[PDB]
Write an enzyme that holds these catalytic residues in place. Sequence first.
Site, mmCIF file in Angstrom:
data_model
loop_
_atom_site.group_PDB
_atom_site.id
_atom_site.type_symbol
_atom_site.label_atom_id
_atom_site.label_comp_id
_atom_site.label_asym_id
_atom_site.label_seq_id
_atom_site.Cartn_x
_atom_site.Cartn_y
_atom_site.Cartn_z
ATOM 1 N N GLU A 1 3.854 -37.080 -41.474
ATOM 2 C CA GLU A 1 2.967 -36.753 -42.795
ATOM 3 C C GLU A 1 2.712 -35.635 -42.911
ATOM 4 O O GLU A 1 2.368 -34.574 -42.241
ATOM 5 C CB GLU A 1 1.656 -37.178 -42.129
ATOM 6 C CG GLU A 1 0.736 -37.035 -43.439
ATOM 7 C CD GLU A 1 -0.237 -38.735 -44.301
ATOM 8 O OE1 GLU A 1 -1.186 -38.806 -42.778
ATOM 9 O OE2 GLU A 1 0.226 -38.825 -45.638
ATOM 10 N N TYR B 1 2.739 -31.321 -45.485
ATOM 11 C CA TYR B 1 1.891 -30.721 -47.025
ATOM 12 C C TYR B 1 2.167 -28.999 -46.993
ATOM 13 O O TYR B 1 2.534 -28.986 -45.685
ATOM 14 C CB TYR B 1 0.700 -31.240 -46.761
ATOM 15 C CG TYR B 1 -0.404 -30.974 -45.955
ATOM 16 C CD1 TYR B 1 -0.633 -30.441 -45.254
ATOM 17 C CD2 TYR B 1 -0.388 -32.397 -44.806
ATOM 18 C CE1 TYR B 1 -1.471 -29.860 -44.004
ATOM 19 C CE2 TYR B 1 -1.328 -32.099 -43.213
ATOM 20 C CZ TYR B 1 -1.375 -30.944 -43.209
ATOM 21 O OH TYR B 1 -2.305 -30.532 -41.919
ATOM 22 N N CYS C 1 2.709 -33.533 -37.961
ATOM 23 C CA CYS C 1 1.867 -33.569 -39.131
ATOM 24 C C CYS C 1 1.807 -31.900 -38.817
ATOM 25 O O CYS C 1 1.590 -31.165 -38.026
ATOM 26 C CB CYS C 1 0.274 -35.000 -38.273
ATOM 27 S SG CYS C 1 -0.809 -34.389 -40.313
ATOM 28 N N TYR D 1 -7.284 -35.044 -47.430
ATOM 29 C CA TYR D 1 -7.787 -33.920 -45.582
ATOM 30 C C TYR D 1 -7.598 -35.062 -43.990
ATOM 31 O O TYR D 1 -8.097 -35.846 -43.911
ATOM 32 C CB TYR D 1 -8.870 -33.654 -45.839
ATOM 33 C CG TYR D 1 -8.614 -32.169 -46.087
ATOM 34 C CD1 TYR D 1 -9.263 -30.800 -45.793
ATOM 35 C CD2 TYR D 1 -8.990 -32.130 -47.521
ATOM 36 C CE1 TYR D 1 -8.418 -30.083 -46.515
ATOM 37 C CE2 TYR D 1 -9.351 -31.622 -48.668
ATOM 38 C CZ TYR D 1 -9.105 -30.275 -48.290
ATOM 39 O OH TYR D 1 -9.254 -28.771 -49.286
ATOM 40 N N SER D 2 -6.799 -34.982 -43.743
ATOM 41 C CA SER D 2 -6.609 -35.925 -42.191
ATOM 42 C C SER D 2 -7.671 -36.151 -41.139
ATOM 43 O O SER D 2 -8.514 -35.036 -41.194
ATOM 44 C CB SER D 2 -5.221 -35.520 -41.532
ATOM 45 O OG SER D 2 -4.045 -35.547 -41.761
HETATM 46 C C1 LIG Z 1 -2.118 -36.416 -46.896
HETATM 47 C C2 LIG Z 1 -2.958 -34.961 -46.246
HETATM 48 C C3 LIG Z 1 -3.462 -33.988 -45.409
HETATM 49 C C4 LIG Z 1 -3.819 -33.268 -45.447
HETATM 50 N N1 LIG Z 1 -4.685 -32.660 -43.969
HETATM 51 C C5 LIG Z 1 -5.083 -31.533 -44.447
HETATM 52 C C6 LIG Z 1 -5.538 -30.430 -42.952
HETATM 53 O O1 LIG Z 1 -6.787 -31.900 -42.244
HETATM 54 N N2 LIG Z 1 -6.198 -29.735 -42.930
HETATM 55 C C7 LIG Z 1 -5.982 -28.896 -44.397
HETATM 56 O O2 LIG Z 1 -6.712 -27.705 -44.116
HETATM 57 N N3 LIG Z 1 -5.600 -29.163 -45.626
HETATM 58 C C8 LIG Z 1 -4.844 -30.663 -45.336
HETATM 59 N N4 LIG Z 1 -4.343 -30.929 -46.267
HETATM 60 C C9 LIG Z 1 -3.689 -30.224 -47.739
HETATM 61 C C10 LIG Z 1 -4.772 -30.204 -48.985
HETATM 62 O O3 LIG Z 1 -5.178 -31.020 -49.256
HETATM 63 C C11 LIG Z 1 -5.253 -29.294 -49.528
HETATM 64 O O4 LIG Z 1 -4.036 -29.186 -50.493
HETATM 65 C C12 LIG Z 1 -5.137 -27.574 -48.504
HETATM 66 O O5 LIG Z 1 -6.742 -26.718 -48.622
HETATM 67 C C13 LIG Z 1 -5.419 -26.218 -50.379
HETATM 68 O O6 LIG Z 1 -6.711 -27.235 -51.097
HETATM 69 P P1 LIG Z 1 -7.332 -26.333 -52.084
HETATM 70 O O7 LIG Z 1 -8.255 -26.452 -52.795
HETATM 71 O O8 LIG Z 1 -8.244 -25.379 -50.629
HETATM 72 O O9 LIG Z 1 -6.329 -24.977 -52.947
HETATM 73 P P2 LIG Z 1 -6.279 -25.271 -54.432
HETATM 74 O O10 LIG Z 1 -7.108 -24.615 -55.458
HETATM 75 O O11 LIG Z 1 -5.402 -25.880 -54.796
HETATM 76 O O12 LIG Z 1 -5.044 -24.315 -54.159
HETATM 77 C C14 LIG Z 1 -3.854 -23.874 -53.884
HETATM 78 C C15 LIG Z 1 -3.302 -22.509 -53.315
HETATM 79 O O13 LIG Z 1 -2.540 -21.934 -54.099
HETATM 80 C C16 LIG Z 1 -3.500 -19.926 -53.826
HETATM 81 N N5 LIG Z 1 -3.208 -20.192 -55.602
HETATM 82 C C17 LIG Z 1 -4.202 -20.650 -56.296
HETATM 83 N N6 LIG Z 1 -4.429 -19.122 -56.861
HETATM 84 C C18 LIG Z 1 -3.496 -18.452 -57.302
HETATM 85 C C19 LIG Z 1 -2.870 -17.577 -58.103
HETATM 86 N N7 LIG Z 1 -3.137 -17.637 -59.344
HETATM 87 N N8 LIG Z 1 -1.824 -17.015 -57.502
HETATM 88 C C20 LIG Z 1 -1.503 -16.890 -55.918
HETATM 89 N N9 LIG Z 1 -1.955 -18.167 -55.300
HETATM 90 C C21 LIG Z 1 -3.026 -18.510 -56.367
HETATM 91 C C22 LIG Z 1 -4.494 -20.668 -53.506
HETATM 92 O O14 LIG Z 1 -4.850 -19.645 -52.531
HETATM 93 C C23 LIG Z 1 -4.412 -22.093 -52.318
HETATM 94 O O15 LIG Z 1 -2.876 -21.118 -51.121
HETATM 95 C C24 LIG Z 1 -3.828 -32.423 -46.647
HETATM 96 C C25 LIG Z 1 -2.849 -32.079 -47.482
HETATM 97 C C26 LIG Z 1 -2.114 -33.745 -47.726
HETATM 98 C C27 LIG Z 1 -1.603 -33.754 -49.057
#
Ligand SMILES: Cc1cc2nc3c(=O)[nH]c(=O)nc-3n(C[C@H](O)[C@H](O)[C@H](O)COP(=O)(O)OP(=O)(O)OC[C@H]3O[C@@H](n4cnc5c(N)ncnc54)[C@H](O)[C@@H]3O)c2cc1C
Length: 311
Positions: free
Chosen positions: A309, A311, A269, A88-89
């Site tokens: 950057e 994602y 971003c 997360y940024s």
């Molecule tokens: C450098 C960098 C910076 C970032 N900065 C930010 C930031 O500032 N703010 C931010 O909000 N995020 C940011 N992100 C993204 C963050 O890292 C996550 O990827 C994001 O919050 C989603 O993670 P999660 O654990 O909620 O979801 P995860 O559990 O990983 O799930 C991924 C997606 O899959 C979907 N999913 C899961 N299971 C199923 C299924 N069976 N069928 C269909 N869909 C499904 C979920 O609903 C979700 O949308 C950044 C990523 C990077 C690489």
Amino acid sequence: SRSKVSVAPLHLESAKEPPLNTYKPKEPFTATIVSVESLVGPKAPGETCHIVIDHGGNVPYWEGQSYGVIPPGENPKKPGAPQNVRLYSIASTRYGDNFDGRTGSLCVRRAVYYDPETGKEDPSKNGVCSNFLCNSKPGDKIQLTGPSGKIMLLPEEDPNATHIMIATGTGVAPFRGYLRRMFMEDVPNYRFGGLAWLFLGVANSDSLLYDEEFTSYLKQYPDNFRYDKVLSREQKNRSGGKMYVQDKIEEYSDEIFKLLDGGAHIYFCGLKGMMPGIQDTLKKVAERRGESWDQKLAQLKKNKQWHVEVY
Ligand SMILES: Cc1cc2nc3c(=O)[nH]c(=O)nc-3n(C[C@H](O)[C@H](O)[C@H](O)COP(=O)(O)OP(=O)(O)OC[C@H]3O[C@@H](n4cnc5c(N)ncnc54)[C@H](O)[C@@H]3O)c2cc1C
């Protein structure tokens, strides 16, 4: 209150290089949640929250870096093993929202799943870490790793440089940090006198993030800050189509390319889906000026003016 806010401790300016991977997944730092608040209105497509974390000065970072968060539970792919880290940024300056160098802030979009046909939500398919974070309450503990990232570090060699920042949604995070350092905080060794231009694309007015803060900069530093908002579902471009950030960039294409030729830094971003449309627009503008975009972009990267950057 047009005066800059005192920040401490100033020794955070003494580091010659940014901290990197201070904490790794193997042994994360256990931080504590200070506050969690929604940043959006009722009309927003989804919830985006602002989270303040107390790291007690144990996990310092530079503006533009990211924090890694390991949500509780087991790896659904690897039973017994911990969850994967989500990055997360950081949306705050190295001093943090409390100006004491003890906290860091995150801007998190709740990832929720809705069946495309019935339209009903299925919690079992929601994003694990994003919902874990926005559901947090003061006092809750969080496993932190990092900081990580060097791509979005702010070039400070030229205090009068020009920085064009393009963000969509949560991509505004690093820029909130940049702007506070440039205009809000009293940092003796970095007095910004250049031009900062923020372009922010979101769904609608209720989805705007930190609008009151950015608007305040316009009134305080009219000669050093420009702010353009793009509300996709409320505005249309010159063609009847939905208004996106690349459309706003095209409107200022002449001035933007002049700045780039002059050495301006440009940052992107947010969600990766924003890049294709922007690239196509930049390509068109470049050729209009009689240049090859492929060649101009190669030069921008070689000059270290291109920062991306997504994602
Ligand atoms: C450098 C960098 C910076 C970032 N900065 C930010 C930031 O500032 N703010 C931010 O909000 N995020 C940011 N992100 C993204 C963050 O890292 C996550 O990827 C994001 O919050 C989603 O993670 P999660 O654990 O909620 O979801 P995860 O559990 O990983 O799930 C991924 C997606 O899959 C979907 N999913 C899961 N299971 C199923 C299924 N069976 N069928 C269909 N869909 C499904 C979920 O609903 C979700 O949308 C950044 C990523 C990077 C690489």
